[PDB]
Design a protein around this ligand. Structure first.
Ligand SMILES: Nc1ncnc2c1ncn2[C@@H]1O[C@H](COP(=O)(O)OP(=O)(O)OP(=O)(O)O)[C@@H](O)[C@H]1O
Ligand SMILES: [Ca+2]
Ligand SMILES: [Ca+2]
Ligand SMILES: [Ca+2]
Ligand SMILES: [Ca+2]
Ligand SMILES: [Ca+2]
Lengths: 368, 327
């Protein structure tokens, strides 16, 4: 009896079976729908890859905004498609592990648990805290995690396997944001990216040529003095555009949210702020165990930069360490897979019997 | 807290998808290719050590970390967790064996291949540090693996020996024997520089090993060798001393290392390092000296070694090397 593992991201759905080293299926957390005849058997809803490749007859919607589920009906579309189309299993036959965001509201956990039991008739289920999974994935149970993905960035202090809620930090600036911003600057550059179809082009330019400068001002200078920083990117029509300083200005946003109109501080300040919210005792451990996770932490150079900045906020002595797993696009999923493969989970599950007696509430006492 | 180690302890060993108990009579020994969990009750709370062997896979390590937490939970979460990676065991965890050495075999249960088979003929590098803490790490049975500064054990169902290097200290002498008993056979106590023709045969090759006037000095326990990490990754040059026992892992492929064996200083350049890093390392190596406690022997040679091409006088300072490691 194999268990299913599901990491519902704001922009990506990573799903697979417990035990496997990687998601079997990764696809956009998007559900499309006619923008108002077509053929016959007119589909009220298309999802994921398929809702992207098209887009012309739609709206394209996002059940999860900033880590939280907000469009439940559409979310169910995501869970069904996950279950019946990508993984190709029947939910009643497998225990299911779902992931959630750090401060997910007690109301959401319930809905989630209710849906999984009343709508998919699952045998058992469980919900884990994303960042914590990524920490396990690295073999730690203490340390502060940086989880920046497509819709949010989190600073999540973990001590002995438990997140410290008073110390968590949520920053609604991440993947998508940086992409869109890259379109703005490139457009100001002279090239023109505005169309949604072009949004995806830019996304690839973002994942392939952007980087974080060690010293933004110097880089700015160098980019303006020579052309050593410039890169050529061939568009689909064959036209070759050159992106220069915008290579680092894009993710520079992380450290200076000021660049996209946000009031918030930078990911290095929030980390410091967070660490300082925790007992003075475990702060050393925290600084030595900065574990990065999420697609937006993949920019070449962010690790070192992150080290620089915190080194200047932390006390003169503190040893700073930034762990940056290569596999970090899937920490959450990996850890979840491993956690659900452990024989000890069997007992940790929320069985349907239990759900029938106690109801949704049970998730608060059973998971935590 | 901190006591003897004489206390009651429970040791597990994350095998496949379960933490399976470890024969109490072998507590001391560990498989460097697996991850363990150990519950120890002081002599006055408790503490759990999550020991992650150097060659254990993520699935194990990940598993071992989760079970450490789940155990902590199960016991009301009063015990203290403590993650220790191979080679960096704390003084205390190191004492959980009445004074016996901590033995570390090659392999372990790669669950989808099970427990690996011992050997056919094997060798151990038995080293100890300032505080007597001793380790017996299994290494390939090759001549080129010996180190004039330690004691080794060569078990070879055909025969078996207890080679003792010039600079080998008592602690390593002792723990060298303990390892022999532990798994079975009587030596042929042989010292370095006066060894039988059939010891060289167990290793099947010739010799020419890890040695140097410093390695052969049994007074090293005065100015122990030190490893420094020199990186400019943050925008300024900084040097950090490398705590714990010098291991091949400790060498930052990313930067430039300083291995100061007092009578000499190796500047180890990481493959992906930076020229500016090497330069400043040298500038510093040359300045660590001169600021010399005049205890600082004349004009110490500074030597430069590139990643993958380190000489025996360098590698003999790392607890168990691995020609194939960065490849
Ligand atoms: N090499 C790369 N560089 C920069 N960003 C990347 C790279 N690869 C992926 N990303 C970004 O990661 C984001 C998706 O990864 P992730 O799995 O973290 O999304 P998510 O989990 O849905 O986001 P969140 O957890 O915020 O809800 C996308 O915005 C994508 O651009
Ligand atoms: Ca996520
Ligand atoms: Ca505890
Ligand atoms: Ca193993
Ligand atoms: Ca020695
Ligand atoms: Ca470097």
């Amino acid at each position: 009896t194999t268990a299913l593992v599901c990491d519902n991201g704001s922009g990506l759905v990573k799903a697979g079976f417990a035990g496997d080293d990687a998601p079997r299926a990764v696809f956009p957390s998007i559900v499309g729908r006619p923008r108002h005849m077509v053929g016959m058997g007119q589909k009220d809803s298309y999802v994921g890859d398929e809702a992207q490749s098209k887009r012309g007859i739609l709206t394209l919607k996002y059940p999860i905004e900033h880590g939280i589920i907000t469009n439940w009906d559409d979310m169910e579309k995501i869970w069904h498609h996950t279950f019946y189309n990508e993984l190709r299993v029947a939910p009643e036959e497998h225990p299911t592990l779902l992931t959630e965001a750090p401060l997910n509201p007690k109301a959401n956990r319930e809905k989630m648990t209710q849906i999984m039991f009343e709508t998919f008739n699952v045998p058992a289920m469980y919900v884990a805290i994303q960042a914590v999974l990524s920490l396990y994935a690295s073999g730690r149970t203490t340390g502060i995690v940086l989880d920046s993905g497509d819709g949010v960035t989190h600073n999540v202090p973990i001590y002995e396997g438990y997140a410290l809620p008073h110390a968590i930090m949520r920053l609604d600036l991440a993947g998508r944001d940086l992409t869109d911003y890259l379109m703005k600057i490139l457009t100001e550059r002279g090239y023109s990216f505005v169309t949604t179809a072009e949004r995806e082009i830019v996304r690839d330019i973002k994942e392939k040529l952007c980087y974080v400068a060690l010293d933004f001002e110097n880089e700015m200078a160098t980019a303006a003095s020579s052309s050593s920083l410039e890169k050529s990117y061939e568009l689909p029509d064959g036209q070759v555009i050159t992106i220069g300083n915008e290579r680092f200005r894009c993710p520079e946003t992380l450290f200076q949210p000021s660049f996209i109109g946000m009031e918030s501080a930078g990911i290095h300040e929030t980390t410091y702020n967070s660490i300082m919210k925790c007992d003075i005792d475990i702060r050393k451990d925290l600084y030595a165990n900065n574990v990065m996770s999420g697609g937006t932490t993949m920019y070449p150079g962010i690790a070192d930069r992150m080290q620089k900045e915190i080194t200047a906020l932390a006390p003169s002595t503190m040893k700073i360490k930034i762990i940056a797993p290569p596999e970090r696009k899937y920490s959450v999923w990996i850890g979840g897979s491993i956690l659900a493969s452990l024989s000890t989970f069997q007992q940790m599950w929320i069985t349907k019997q239990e759900y029938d007696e106690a109801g949704p509430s049970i998730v608060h006492r059973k998971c935590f | 807290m901190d006591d003897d180690g004489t206390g009651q302890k429970q040791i597990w060993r994350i095998e496949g998808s379960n933490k399976v108990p470890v024969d109490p009579a072998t507590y001391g020994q560990f498989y460097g290719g697996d991850s363990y969990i150990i519950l120890y009750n002081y002599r006055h709370g408790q503490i759990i050590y999550n020991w992650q062997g150097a060659q254990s896979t993520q699935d194990e390590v990940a598993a071992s970390a989760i079970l450490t937490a789940q155990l902590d939970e199960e016991l009301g979460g009063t015990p203290v967790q403590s993650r220790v990676v191979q080679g960096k065991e704390p003084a205390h965890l190191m004492s959980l064996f009445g004074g016996k050495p901590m033995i570390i075999y090659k392999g372990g249960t790669s669950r989808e291949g099970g427990q690996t088979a011992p050997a056919s003929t094997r060798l151990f590098q038995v080293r100890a540090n300032s505080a007597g803490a001793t380790r017996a790490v299994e290494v390939l049975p090759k001549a080129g693996a010996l180190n004039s500064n330690d004691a080794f054990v060569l078990k070879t169902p055909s025969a078996a020996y207890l080679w003792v290097g010039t600079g080998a200290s008592e602690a390593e002498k002792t723990g060298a024997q303990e390892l022999l008993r532990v798994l079975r056979a009587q030596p042929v106590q042989v010292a370095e520089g006066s060894e039988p023709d059939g010891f060289w045969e167990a290793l099947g090759g010739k010799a020419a090993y890890r040695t140097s006037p410093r390695l052969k000095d049994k007074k090293m326990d005065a100015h122990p060798p030190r490893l420094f990490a020199c990186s400019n990754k943050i925008g300024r040059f900084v040097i950090e001393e490398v705590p714990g026992e010098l291991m091949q892992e400790d060498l930052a492929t990313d930067d430039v290392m300083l291995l100061d064996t007092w009578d000499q200083v190796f500047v180890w350049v990481g493959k992906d390092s930076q020229e500016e890093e090497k330069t400043e390392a040298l500038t510093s190596a040359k300045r660590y000296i001169e600021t010399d406690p005049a205890n600082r022997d004349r004009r110490t040679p500074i030597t430069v070694v590139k990643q993958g091409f380190e000489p025996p006088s360098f590698v003999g300072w790392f607890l168990g090397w691995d020609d194939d490691y960065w490849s």
